[PDB]
Amino acid sequence: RFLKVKNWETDVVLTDTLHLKSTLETGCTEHICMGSIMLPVRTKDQLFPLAKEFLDQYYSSIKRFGSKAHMDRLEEVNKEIESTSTYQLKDTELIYGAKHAWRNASRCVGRIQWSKLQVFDARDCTTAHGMFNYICNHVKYATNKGNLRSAITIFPQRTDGKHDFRVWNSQLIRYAGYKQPDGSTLGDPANVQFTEICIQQGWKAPRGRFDVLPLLLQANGNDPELFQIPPELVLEVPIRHPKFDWFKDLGLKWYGLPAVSNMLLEIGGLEFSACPFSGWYMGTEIGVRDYCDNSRYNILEEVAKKMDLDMRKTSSLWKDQALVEINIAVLYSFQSDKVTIVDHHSATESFIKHMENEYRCRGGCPADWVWIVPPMSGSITPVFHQEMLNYRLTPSFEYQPDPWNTHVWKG
Amino acid sequence: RFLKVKNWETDVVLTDTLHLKSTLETGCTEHICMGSIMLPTKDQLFPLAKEFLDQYYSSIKRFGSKAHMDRLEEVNKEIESTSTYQLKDTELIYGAKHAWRNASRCVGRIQWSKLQVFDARDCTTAHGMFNYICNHVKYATNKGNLRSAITIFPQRTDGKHDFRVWNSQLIRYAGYKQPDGSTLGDPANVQFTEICIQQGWKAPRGRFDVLPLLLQANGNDPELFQIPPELVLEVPIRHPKFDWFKDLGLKWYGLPAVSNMLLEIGGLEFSACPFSGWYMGTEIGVRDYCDNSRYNILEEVAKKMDLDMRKTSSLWKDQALVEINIAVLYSFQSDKVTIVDHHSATESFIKHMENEYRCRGGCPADWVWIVPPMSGSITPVFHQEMLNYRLTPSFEYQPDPWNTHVW
Numbered sequence A: 001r002f003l004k005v006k007n008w009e010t011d012v013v014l015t016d017t018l019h020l021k022s023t024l025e026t027g028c029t030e031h032i033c034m035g036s037i038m039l040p041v042r043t044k045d046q047l048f049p050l051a052k053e054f055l056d057q058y059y060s061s062i063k064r065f066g067s068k069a070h071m072d073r074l075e076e077v078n079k080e081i082e083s084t085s086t087y088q089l090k091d092t093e094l095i096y097g098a099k100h101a102w103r104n105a106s107r108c109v110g111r112i113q114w115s116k117l118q119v120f121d122a123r124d125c126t127t128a129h130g131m132f133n134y135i136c137n138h139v140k141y142a143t144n145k146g147n148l149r150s151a152i153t154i155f156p157q158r159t160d161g162k163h164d165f166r167v168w169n170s171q172l173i174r175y176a177g178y179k180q181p182d183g184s185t186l187g188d189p190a191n192v193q194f195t196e197i198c199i200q201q202g203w204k205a206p207r208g209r210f211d212v213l214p215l216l217l218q219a220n221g222n223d224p225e226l227f228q229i230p231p232e233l234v235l236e237v238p239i240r241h242p243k244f245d246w247f248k249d250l251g252l253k254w255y256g257l258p259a260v261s262n263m264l265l266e267i268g269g270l271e272f273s274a275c276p277f278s279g280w281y282m283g284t285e286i287g288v289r290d291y292c293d294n295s296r297y298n299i300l301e302e303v304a305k306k307m308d309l310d311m312r313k314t315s316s317l318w319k320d321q322a323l324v325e326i327n328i329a330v331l332y333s334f335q336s337d338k339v340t341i342v343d344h345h346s347a348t349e350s351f352i353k354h355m356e357n358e359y360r361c362r363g364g365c366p367a368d369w370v371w372i373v374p375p376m377s378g379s380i381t382p383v384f385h386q387e388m389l390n391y392r393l394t395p396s397f398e399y400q401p402d403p404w405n406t407h408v409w410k411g
Numbered sequence B: 001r002f003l004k005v006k007n008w009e010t011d012v013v014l015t016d017t018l019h020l021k022s023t024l025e026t027g028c029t030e031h032i033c034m035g036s037i038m039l040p041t042k043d044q045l046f047p048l049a050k051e052f053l054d055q056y057y058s059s060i061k062r063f064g065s066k067a068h069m070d071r072l073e074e075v076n077k078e079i080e081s082t083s084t085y086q087l088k089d090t091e092l093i094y095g096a097k098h099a100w101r102n103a104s105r106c107v108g109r110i111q112w113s114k115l116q117v118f119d120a121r122d123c124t125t126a127h128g129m130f131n132y133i134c135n136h137v138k139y140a141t142n143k144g145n146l147r148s149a150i151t152i153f154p155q156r157t158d159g160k161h162d163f164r165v166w167n168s169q170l171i172r173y174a175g176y177k178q179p180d181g182s183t184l185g186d187p188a189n190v191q192f193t194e195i196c197i198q199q200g201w202k203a204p205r206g207r208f209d210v211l212p213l214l215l216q217a218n219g220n221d222p223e224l225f226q227i228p229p230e231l232v233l234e235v236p237i238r239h240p241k242f243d244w245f246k247d248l249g250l251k252w253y254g255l256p257a258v259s260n261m262l263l264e265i266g267g268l269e270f271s272a273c274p275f276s277g278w279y280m281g282t283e284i285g286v287r288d289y290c291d292n293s294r295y296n297i298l299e300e301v302a303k304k305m306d307l308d309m310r311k312t313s314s315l316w317k318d319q320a321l322v323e324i325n326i327a328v329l330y331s332f333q334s335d336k337v338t339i340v341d342h343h344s345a346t347e348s349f350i351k352h353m354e355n356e357y358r359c360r361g362g363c364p365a366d367w368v369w370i371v372p373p374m375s376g377s378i379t380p381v382f383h384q385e386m387l388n389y390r391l392t393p394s395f396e397y398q399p400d401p402w403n404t405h406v407w
């Protein structure tokens, strides 16, 4: 069964066959669409089918399907599962798996880069101190003095679920948030709950508006431990505007390196619960969401006042006007400091090219329109007018519950 | 099975049971979501009519009354004999308001119960259609105090006798290819503007030529009718700060009146049911003016603002887009024409959703269409989870008549 999608601005039509390789479920049915729902322990029973499918994929990609290298690997994995109840990926399989989990991330507009991913194998890690060292090296490598490089670091896979490696931070670099007695919030409101855990675990909080959070690292199911990232590794950019001199006086900065650390990487049935990865920012992540979301820094009002906008009625679009200037300042500041960043016009244009290329060479490109379209100026980007098919391929990145809600404390 | 939707900006959680009353299919499966796809006999008729009469008499708190059961057998006998049936005026008004209420792609549905229904089922000719349409336009326009209205022409009988308004909206600007190569006027209406000329229309060949109406009664050839200009309220577009904005020579009409959709009530199909409300600002400013496939005046505006158009990272398009949309709102508001900005409209819809979860058990909603085409995340609906499902009565798409009509 072939499926077509249409770009309604160019009339280009594309044919998806790759959705036939879709295993997982979307959450949708014939009678309901959960397209906008934000979120819609494994035995030897189902593992070898999951492993064989991944290995079939792996050996297809290298043009050795059905070879003796392929059949022996299948046999090897079979005997390892039936006797050890799990198995270990070769280095080549891990690299392929990580790259394809990114390739398969239907919510990711940056997937034109998916094949230039630097994979750090940290499966020999055993302790939190060891995790910190692997994360420090990730951050240094990925940052590259502002010439950002995509990287993932993969910690040991889950076994019985009682010995998990987890990074308790949602991103490796994030600012603290502090609920004040008067109901206001100092710093990033997104991070208040994590900040409180850190403070309870012994972190001395500087209690400023842009304090880099410590790393809270869990090795082998042990209680997590605190580590401070060396500040010389945390590249930050002061935010100024090319024409508004008062903008620097808002005292804003952001960090250079977006590095998501709370997701789960699934490869051939194995679960890598700690797999922090990083690329580089699209400016609207900072300028639109991080600064202008009502539940975040919410500097829209203050930028609006300083611009002297008509703030009495919303139909003056003072919010829209302030949001554009903030986003201009974010891109100006990063480019002025030679830190890698991409505006939403460039990134969505690249995604369309990637997606057409993926339809031609792969037969499909799963894509989540709700997440691909940028949070500002949606329809003047080319993805807005693009029909998109969303379906789940493996290897994949998955959500997982926050570890402080599942963790058994040792004391 | 009793589904939850979360607002991530406010943690408000709503519980949806109305989706279990859903009947039609979404185009999605558990293996693939089609949420971003633009378009996915005598015996099926009595179940359909029963469903609709069941909710109708429930909505007036007379479910299982003699009147209910009498109407049910009455319609059943009508179907057995005449192979169709006719709606009472009250059921017709109900079905129209609820088709709007069920329109999961419509952000303006907080207004759904104030719809003015014009029963035009006695109409038999295109001249008759034109008359009903002129009355509609003048009622809905209300000298700029816009009012929602629908006009319902006779229902389909056998596909041979369809009533159809060939225009996509009652009021739309003409578009022409140039010998030079580009497009003068509205590019979305190029093929229809051609059908009109290739029908007998004499185009002024301007930028903002109000298209004539092309009306089809009882399945005959359609006929051209010029809507009287004094019924077509237009707003000249100026900017409240930039005096050079007037010189761009832009205007838009005040009445969005969609006329190519099909209204389905109790299994009956109304192929001609033009309806009208009022504009959200971004429909004109973002889509009509700045889509590359439309008027696409973004570069000219940014140029006139002396913005650095050399790299995309200056966000010159974004800066221009906002000014254009400030101008549309300022123009309509100054001329006392109803218009809503995307901030007000989405805030209304969140309230409307809360109302529907409270008083109805849910509200079908299509996030891809509810979220405005600019400034998405600073509006409350961006952070709102929504469940999309197809309830009936409903407005449906139908093929363009010029691909179907036996000429």
Ligand code: HEM
Binding pocket: A102, A105, A107, A108, A109, A110, A111, A113, A117, A150, A151, A152, A277, A278, A279, A280, A281, A282, A285, A342, A347, A371, A397
């Ligand atoms: C290199 C530049 C990259 C850019 C510009 C980029 C851009 C984005 C953006 C804007 C989002 C949506 C997040 C939001 O708006 O809240 C996203 C999601 C995502 N990205 Fe990328 N990305 C990049 C690299 C990567 C890499 C290296 C990986 C993994 C190896 C990755 C995997 C994902 C995943 C799994 C999601 C889904 C998030 C979720 O489901 O919540 N991306 N990306």
Ligand code: HEM
Binding pocket: B100, B103, B105, B106, B107, B108, B109, B111, B115, B148, B149, B150, B275, B276, B277, B278, B279, B280, B283, B287, B340, B345, B369, B395
């Ligand atoms: C009164 C003020 C109204 C506002 C502000 C409004 C707003 C909107 C907007 C912005 C859209 C998306 C259109 C686009 O992006 O081009 C839409 C779609 C729609 N509206 Fe409303 N609308 C209003 C009234 C009505 C009325 C009176 C009806 C019918 C009686 C209606 C039925 C629909 C339908 C069926 C759709 C979706 C059409 C489709 O599936 O493509 N609307 N509306």
Ligand SMILES: Nc1ccc2c(n1)CC(OCc1cccc(CNCc3ccccn3)c1)=CC2
Binding pocket: A038, A039, A110, A258, A260, A278, A279, A280, A281, A282, A285, B008
């Ligand atoms: N420039 C780049 C480069 C790479 C990546 C990103 N950006 C962004 C990204 O995703 C970032 C994200 C944003 C919102 C919610 C989540 C999901 N995690 C928390 C949560 C909160 C609320 C509801 C559900 N889930 C994750 C992954 C990779």
Ligand SMILES: Nc1ccc2c(n1)CC(OCc1cccc(CNCc3ccccn3)c1)=CC2
Binding pocket: B038, B039, B108, B256, B258, B276, B277, B278, B279, B280, B283
């Ligand atoms: N202010 C108001 C008030 C009421 C309404 C509207 N606005 C707007 C509206 O419909 C807005 C629309 C937008 C794009 C495409 C379509 C559908 N046109 C047919 C088509 C052709 C080709 C591809 C896809 N679809 C419709 C209905 C009612």
Ligand SMILES: C[C@H](O)[C@H](O)[C@H]1CNc2nc(N)[nH]c(=O)c2N1
Binding pocket: A008, A384, A385, A386, A387, A388, B036, B037, B038, B368, B369, B370, B371
């Ligand atoms: C590809 C996508 O289905 C198409 O461009 C849609 C996206 N969302 C939209 N949303 C609204 N309100 N109106 C539209 O015309 C569209 N177009």
Ligand SMILES: C[C@H](O)[C@H](O)[C@H]1CNc2nc(N)[nH]c(=O)c2N1
Binding pocket: A036, A037, A038, A370, A371, A372, A373, B008, B382, B383, B384, B385, B386
């Ligand atoms: C309700 C909705 O699913 C949710 O707010 C989504 C919408 N689309 C998004 N798109 C991106 N890129 N990032 C997001 O966090 C979200 N949030």
Ligand SMILES: [Zn+2]
Binding pocket: A028, A032, A033, A034, A035, B028, B032, B033, B034, B035
């Ligand atoms: Zn779906």
